[PDB]
């Protein structure tokens, strides 16, 4: 919970970019893959999000899995600024 | 206690201000309606006072 | 299970003794400013030294001074 807010923001941004998040169940890990923050912090953030709706979480095989609901997405957008017609993975980028 | 402990322990819930179920013949009529006129739904079997469908 | 030991002395996290609009810095004229103590050499101005009896440090670099001032 005790997060330097910048890190949190970064995490949020990453999530937005993804439309998804995959974490380990590994506390004590110094830095996460992709994001330059502690994995534990990320996990905590995800948990928090879940607690206020937004994210859907699965704890299978030492790997936390995360997907954003519409409301969650909206919240993320609000946090960021970005208005409409944006990334996540709710729709394809072009042809793939 | 060891002398009517249970009667004192319970929370008193209050009689809800519900409408009167009418007396004499009206009641009988209602019963009749419930029974043979309206005909309650049955998957296989009849039942007078059903449950909310759950375990 | 086995009973807990009970010596007695408990230690809690200090509440910190928070203080703001601290008596550091000053102004005499009005127009210009008069800095008290000193700013950090390592980091930029805005951060201020901790003053003790021939011992200094600063918090942005957790604590990393030695020379007097």
């Amino acid at each position: 919970m005790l997060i330097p807010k910048e890190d949190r923001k970064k995490i949020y941004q990453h999530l937005f970019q993804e439309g998804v998040l995959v974490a380990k169940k590994d506390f004590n890990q110094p830095k996460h893959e992709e994001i330059d923050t502690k994995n534990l912090f990320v996990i905590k953030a995800l948990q928090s999000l879940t607690s206020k709706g937004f994210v859907k979480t699965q704890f299978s095989w030492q790997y936390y899995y995360y997907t954003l609901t519409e409301e969650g997405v909206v919240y993320l957008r609000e946090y960021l600024n970005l208005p409409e017609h944006i990334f996540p993975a709710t729709y394809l980028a072009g042809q793939s | 206690a060891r002398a009517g402990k249970v009667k004192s322990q319970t929370p008193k819930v209050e009689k809800q201000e519900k409408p009167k179920q009418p007396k004499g013949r009206a009641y009988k009529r209602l019963l009749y309606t419930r029974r043979f006129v309206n005909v309650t739904l049955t998957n296989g079997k009849r039942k007078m006072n059903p449950s909310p469908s759950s375990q | 299970k086995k009973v807990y030991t009970t010596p007695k002395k408990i230690r809690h996290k200090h509440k910190k003794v928070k203080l703001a609009v601290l008596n550091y810095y000053k102004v005499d004229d009005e127009g210009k400013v008069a800095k008290l103590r000193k700013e950090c050499p390592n980091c930029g101005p805005g951060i201020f030294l901790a003053n003790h009896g021939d011992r200094f440090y600063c918090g942005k670099c957790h604590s990393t001074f030695a020379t007097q001032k």
Partner: protein
């Protein structure tokens, strides 16, 4: 499926994240089962669902 590529896409992404793959190299497809009753796992799942719902 979701609504023309959504849930499936998400799943794919998750998989990629898990196992260090790139986009394109994983292709998910959601197909029907030829006769559900012959399958066992499906039946079990159904039973579980029923139980959850609250049936005799």
């Amino acid at each position: 499926v979701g609504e023309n590529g959504r849930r499936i896409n998400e799943l794919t992404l998750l998989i990629e994240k898990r196992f260090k793959y790139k986009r394109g190299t994983i292709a998910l497809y959601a197909e029907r089962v030829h006769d559900r009753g012959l399958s066992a796992v499906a039946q079990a799942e159904s039973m579980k669902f029923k139980l959850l719902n609250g049936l005799a």
